[PDB]
Amino acid sequence: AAMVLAYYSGYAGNYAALTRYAASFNAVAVDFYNITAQGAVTGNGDPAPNDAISFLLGRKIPAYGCVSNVDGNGNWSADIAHAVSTSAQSQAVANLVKFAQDKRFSGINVDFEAVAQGDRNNFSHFIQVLGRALHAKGLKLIVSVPAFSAKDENHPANYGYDLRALGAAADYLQIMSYDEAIPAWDPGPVAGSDWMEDDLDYAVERVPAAKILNGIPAYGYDWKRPGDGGMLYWKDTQALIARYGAQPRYDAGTHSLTFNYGAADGSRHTVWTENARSVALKASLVNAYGLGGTSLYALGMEDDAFWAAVKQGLAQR
Numbered sequence: 001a002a003m004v005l006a007y008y009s010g011y012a013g014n015y016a017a018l019t020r021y022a023a024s025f026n027a028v029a030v031d032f033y034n035i036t037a038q039g040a041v042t043g044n045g046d047p048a049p050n051d052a053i054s055f056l057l058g059r060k061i062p063a064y065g066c067v068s069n070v071d072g073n074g075n076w077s078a079d080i081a082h083a084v085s086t087s088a089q090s091q092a093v094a095n096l097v098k099f100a101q102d103k104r105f106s107g108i109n110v111d112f113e114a115v116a117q118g119d120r121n122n123f124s125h126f127i128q129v130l131g132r133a134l135h136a137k138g139l140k141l142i143v144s145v146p147a148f149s150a151k152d153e154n155h156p157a158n159y160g161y162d163l164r165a166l167g168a169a170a171d172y173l174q175i176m177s178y179d180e181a182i183p184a185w186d187p188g189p190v191a192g193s194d195w196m197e198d199d200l201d202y203a204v205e206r207v208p209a210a211k212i213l214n215g216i217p218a219y220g221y222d223w224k225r226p227g228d229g230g231m232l233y234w235k236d237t238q239a240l241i242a243r244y245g246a247q248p249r250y251d252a253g254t255h256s257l258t259f260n261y262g263a264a265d266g267s268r269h270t271v272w273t274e275n276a277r278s279v280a281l282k283a284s285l286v287n288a289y290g291l292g293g294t295s296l297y298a299l300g301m302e303d304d305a306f307w308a309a310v311k312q313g314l315a316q317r
């Protein structure tokens, strides 16, 4: 009975995908909300997703309010995470609980990114208190965390996340096992299976596996050159291959698809993305590790073959 958590966020085609694929996922993170440094939950600038929430209630699909520490400029804010975890903790915890109640959410997904390394224990404590408060009301807690293994656990980007502590408090950790490479960096696998398995080994040693969700992207990246690239949605991969007549290579060691092409401006692009084999493989890791399930980022980027591959992999024993 694996959880199959879809992300409903600010992307074109989101609602069409939510409704088209509602037999494929069985929980949704409704990524429409921010929290302030005073602990108040707000909208994120996009229209309130009240239609999506109503749809999910009618389908009996659990919905989680996904709340981010994003400031008024649209930037991840270490300061907001610090404040919520310390001075505004009591307000934030109560407000998150009431927010879930008000919206008829089944729980909260805390998506706090750029947590400062100095806030490791503060953030763990916030999640402990929040988990107890949600549980006291029959609600659940999912915490989204960056994906890493021991070699990088002390990196400034990762040390704020104590998986052992977070996993003991939350119902699930949503391990963001994607963005292994990003446009700002050198080209490479975005969700390589070797890296993912290292990350999952690290997580399940520290957290009961049934409380872990892995993460599978419905996208890859297209680099013009290192540091210069853009997102390529799953649904657009085949058209791009066809536009340039590219011959894609399956990298078996990382279960990732790559290809190159020469653009009209003379640059040689490099794409790393997924195919059906790689998505099924990454979903099959739920059974290989005894995970609680998987998470897919995000609705609106995909087509029917993406969800067919997720289904196939989840059924692989």
Ligand SMILES: [Cl-]
Pocket (backbone or CB within 6 Å): 182, 183, 184, 185
């Ligand atoms: Cl980037």
